[PDB]
Design an enzyme around this catalytic site. Sequence first.
Site, PDB file in Angstrom:
ATOM      1  N   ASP A 148      40.097  33.137  36.915  1.00  0.00           N
ATOM      2  CA  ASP A 148      40.706  33.187  35.586  1.00  0.00           C
ATOM      3  C   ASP A 148      41.602  34.424  35.443  1.00  0.00           C
ATOM      4  O   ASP A 148      41.364  35.439  36.120  1.00  0.00           O
ATOM      5  CB  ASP A 148      39.597  33.268  34.512  1.00  0.00           C
ATOM      6  CG  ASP A 148      38.659  34.481  34.710  1.00  0.00           C
ATOM      7  OD1 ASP A 148      38.363  34.844  35.866  1.00  0.00           O
ATOM      8  OD2 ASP A 148      38.272  35.097  33.705  1.00  0.00           O
ATOM      9  N   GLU A 149      42.640  34.286  34.611  1.00  0.00           N
ATOM     10  CA  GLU A 149      43.447  35.378  34.077  1.00  0.00           C
ATOM     11  C   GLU A 149      44.001  36.406  35.071  1.00  0.00           C
ATOM     12  O   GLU A 149      44.031  37.612  34.790  1.00  0.00           O
ATOM     13  CB  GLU A 149      42.639  36.140  33.033  1.00  0.00           C
ATOM     14  CG  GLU A 149      42.059  35.339  31.892  1.00  0.00           C
ATOM     15  CD  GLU A 149      41.320  36.245  30.934  1.00  0.00           C
ATOM     16  OE1 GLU A 149      40.438  37.036  31.386  1.00  0.00           O
ATOM     17  OE2 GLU A 149      41.667  36.209  29.742  1.00  0.00           O
ATOM     18  N   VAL A 150      44.454  35.953  36.216  1.00  0.00           N
ATOM     19  CA  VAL A 150      45.027  36.870  37.175  1.00  0.00           C
ATOM     20  C   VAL A 150      46.360  37.415  36.624  1.00  0.00           C
ATOM     21  O   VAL A 150      47.190  36.637  36.150  1.00  0.00           O
ATOM     22  CB  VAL A 150      45.306  36.155  38.483  1.00  0.00           C
ATOM     23  CG1 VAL A 150      45.943  37.114  39.471  1.00  0.00           C
ATOM     24  CG2 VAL A 150      44.026  35.571  39.037  1.00  0.00           C
ATOM     25  N   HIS A 192      39.707  40.453  37.583  1.00  0.00           N
ATOM     26  CA  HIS A 192      38.436  40.901  37.034  1.00  0.00           C
ATOM     27  C   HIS A 192      37.622  41.594  38.124  1.00  0.00           C
ATOM     28  O   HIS A 192      36.391  41.489  38.196  1.00  0.00           O
ATOM     29  CB  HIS A 192      37.702  39.720  36.394  1.00  0.00           C
ATOM     30  CG  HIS A 192      38.350  39.200  35.137  1.00  0.00           C
ATOM     31  ND1 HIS A 192      38.223  39.826  33.915  1.00  0.00           N
ATOM     32  CD2 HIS A 192      39.038  38.064  34.896  1.00  0.00           C
ATOM     33  CE1 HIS A 192      38.819  39.114  32.973  1.00  0.00           C
ATOM     34  NE2 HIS A 192      39.298  38.021  33.538  1.00  0.00           N
TER      35      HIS A 192
END
Lengths: 490, 490
Positions: free
Chosen positions: B292-294, B232
């Site tokens: 989060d969400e790498v 992100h």
Amino acid sequence: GPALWPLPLSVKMTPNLLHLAPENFYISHSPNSTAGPSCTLLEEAFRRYHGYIFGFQAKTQVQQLLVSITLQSECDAFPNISSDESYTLLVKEPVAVLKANRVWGALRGLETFSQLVYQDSYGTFTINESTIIDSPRFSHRGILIDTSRHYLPVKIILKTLDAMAFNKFNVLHWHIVDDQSFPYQSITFPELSNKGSYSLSHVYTPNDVRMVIEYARLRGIRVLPEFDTPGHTLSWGKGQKDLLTPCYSGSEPLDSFGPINPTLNTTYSFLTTFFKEISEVFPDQFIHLGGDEVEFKCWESNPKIQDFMRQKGFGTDFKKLESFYIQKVLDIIATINKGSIVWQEVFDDKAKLAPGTIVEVWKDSAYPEELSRVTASGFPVILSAPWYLNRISYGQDWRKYYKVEPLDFGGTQKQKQLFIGGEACLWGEYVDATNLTPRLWPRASAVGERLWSSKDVRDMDDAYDRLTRHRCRMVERGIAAQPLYAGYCN
Amino acid sequence: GPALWPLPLSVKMTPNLLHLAPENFYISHSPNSTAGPSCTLLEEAFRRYHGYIFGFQAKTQVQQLLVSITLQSECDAFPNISSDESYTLLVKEPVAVLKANRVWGALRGLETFSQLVYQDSYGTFTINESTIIDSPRFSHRGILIDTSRHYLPVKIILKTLDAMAFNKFNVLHWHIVDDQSFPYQSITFPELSNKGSYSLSHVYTPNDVRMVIEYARLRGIRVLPEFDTPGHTLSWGKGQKDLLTPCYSGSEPLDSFGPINPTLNTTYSFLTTFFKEISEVFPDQFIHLGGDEVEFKCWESNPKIQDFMRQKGFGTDFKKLESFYIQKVLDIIATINKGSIVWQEVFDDKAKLAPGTIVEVWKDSAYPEELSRVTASGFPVILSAPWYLNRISYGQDWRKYYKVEPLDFGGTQKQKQLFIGGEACLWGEYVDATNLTPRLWPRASAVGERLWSSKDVRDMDDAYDRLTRHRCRMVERGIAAQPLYAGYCN
Ligand SMILES: *[C@@H]1O[C@H](CO)[C@@H](O[C@@H]2O[C@H](CO)[C@@H](O)[C@H](O)[C@H]2NC(C)=O)[C@H](O)[C@H]1NC(C)=O
Ligand SMILES: *[C@@H]1O[C@H](CO)[C@@H](O[C@@H]2O[C@H](CO)[C@@H](O)[C@H](O)[C@H]2NC(C)=O)[C@H](O)[C@H]1NC(C)=O
Ligand SMILES: *[C@@H]1O[C@H](CO)[C@@H](O[C@@H]2O[C@H](CO)[C@@H](O)[C@H](O)[C@H]2NC(C)=O)[C@H](O)[C@H]1NC(C)=O
Ligand SMILES: *[C@@H]1O[C@H](CO)[C@@H](O[C@@H]2O[C@H](CO)[C@@H](O)[C@H](O)[C@H]2NC(C)=O)[C@H](O)[C@H]1NC(C)=O
């Protein structure tokens, strides 16, 4: 660049750049127009469009937009299903021309012209030499609003009509009353609103109603009232005694009430006097009568009504009694020279409808096949079913609305010509002033384009691009339309 | 009557009616308070609560509310996870008393007191003799807002903080940057915002940031910044060269970039200097680091990074490299004396976390079991998972949020004490100024009550009744919170 929405039928751009100067560009009548400086509709539209647009440099200044109406203007009149909304727009230096057969087409053209203008970095108002010839695919392009589930102040209705102009919608389907409240103020029956409204300041006065209608007219929008019978009438009972069906359990009367009671002569003489008033108050040709979602439970429970059923041969079939009812109401309307629109159940439950009677298809259960049946039997049809915008969902639902192709149903070239258009519906249970505008726009714009633009206009990348920019513009003009996805305006 | 929301721990009503006169009721300090007329927090709160409330009659006038702080006031200080928000409220004639250990509890009590007041028909301000003793179930009660997917003007953040006060939330989880834009203006790195922001007027200046933080403080709300690494971070790349992982296809370099590159010493010396600045700018104890969400695709595609992996023994396991990264960032934070919060993936992907480190559980896939694991390993936990309020749906979704019972997961009395509370999250992809407030409220109020009130408070009819009225009040105060269902306010 320019974001056109809805995308006009024919656009012919050149790369020739022209400029508008805020200190001197203005919009006025062509000396050859059939509309004068006497035209209120057009003058107010000139002013408000000047505001929207603003508030090698030789031979590149567009000084004026001239507006020419070609046929009798209709400036003084109310729009209607056959109102000609076609126009052409010639953007050139030094004098751009907008030309339309009628006032209705010029309002459309003014919007489009405004969408052609764009600022570069320095803040120079810029527009390309171009030629646009435009007309709508369908002619009934509606928004349904619901002012019973919540009361909407007039201001919010006004703002919605502005948004509708920006999106080239032309019918406001005003679902003004229903179960929860009756805000309409009746002159012949003051007690409907007195006892049926949420309170005495959640009311629409004859002045409020006059205001909505004229403000609509000035934007080439028809106001189609719906006074839904015989379901969705709880709030009516409060002010008109003996109108609703008393509910029973066996022979015990309950305190509860069901639909309007179609067996009493006082029901129809009430409706006759009521709809006479509606016909005088709302100048549009059509009145929407409703007829959706009637619950029979209470009718079938009522003793006097069961008498009436043996007495007609209706047995246990409460469709025939519902039909008996709506047919009587249909006659009432024909008698005072108006047309009628009707939710599909009136047709499905096998009522006998005068020809001319418009049927609105709302149920999202194989609706192409409803469109087939309804058109097969000769009746004009309008579609809302896939455009229930009260039914929100996470994500870009605007695509779902946009991808609809309404004429993808079975029938002849001529069955299909009975499809006169569509409405995006925003039922009110979960909606009021606080959330209306961003729930509605730009999701309803998807429907606006599908109903105005060519069938062929379908590219999703191009729609996203133009709709992101149109939505940013709506916001500049004070319509709080929500985002499509990440990004920014200015 | 009164709508209390959140419903306090103990309410004891009497049917003794008292009245407040607008021409003379006022709120002031008890002469026995530890806070003075010098207390800015309280004085501004007295004024604004007087506004909210207004703008046999012998011995029934409440003249004054007196406010007494009992312990050292904390008037000058910033709230924190251990801030005492307890209060008691004695509503009696002629002088009502609000008593709290600290400033934080009095702000809460002022809100509750305001909710006790109601108008009858004539417009008489009315309140019942009652006694309220109140304190929150959990102490981390957050709203997450996202100012990257869209920029939110400061005013809208201010308005959100007001709404948060009205609902007794106390943490603003400011997800200030992300992929799409970097609006935060860094003093030590001016180019992050210069090149990463949407434009130069979609920025938060040090003054804007100071403003949000003080305005929060005055309402007993902590500002918890999240600067999400290493996913992100697209927008960060624009202004810090060599920070992101260059993507490859085989040995062809692509133009695209992935996560922050955890293999370079320039990454950590950037992060060190960056987070030093964050620690000085945001006074809260905790910094949220994200994690989060790498997406590994781009990391695993990069040649130099593949070298680094053989060189560490990591094989093909990109969890170990992600861990290697977050551990280094965790150390950076510990070194400048702050605490860290972390989305659950950092824990799931088996990073080694200093004890004290808060873990936020967001994935709605058997989250009770995450709560178990996380607490089993000794770490404070916060739950957002069932409160993703970006994920809208048709109908009364507020019930779904309200029915959650966060401690319905496996573990000991003592595992459960590591659950310090919750956050309602409004991610920004589909949200900006136009739609934030009605999407958020009152849906987030469901979460407010669940996080403040007793576990036992669960009756749905009573919640609907109080929440309809609380929502009407929010609207009176200028928070456009949307309806629960049909009805009206006033
Ligand atoms: C409106 O006019 C502009 C300027 O002529 C057009 O933009 C240029 O288009 C040419 C190719 O036709 C490019 O090589 C230039 O780089 C373009 N941009 C500018 C700023 O000069 C623009 O395309 C025209 N709009 C349309 C829809 O035709
Ligand atoms: C729909 O619109 C047109 C324009 O108002 C109406 O027809 C015209 O009405 C004017 C008088 O207002 C006449 O002078 C024209 O001769 C009419 N032209 C026609 C009938 O083609 C038309 O009546 C409207 N339709 C409805 C149903 O109200
Ligand atoms: C606040 O005081 C009012 C007035 O005393 C209470 O309302 C009355 O309650 C009695 C029973 O206790 C009823 O018989 C009356 O009809 C009630 N209404 C009024 C307007 O007098 C009210 O219940 C009190 N509130 C609470 C929560 O106890
Ligand atoms: C959380 O809040 C309290 C109150 O601000 C902090 O503790 C007090 O700090 C003041 C000085 O500002 C001292 O005079 C007291 O003696 C302190 N009391 C304690 C430690 O119990 C506390 O440090 C804050 N926590 C964090 C992490 O910032």
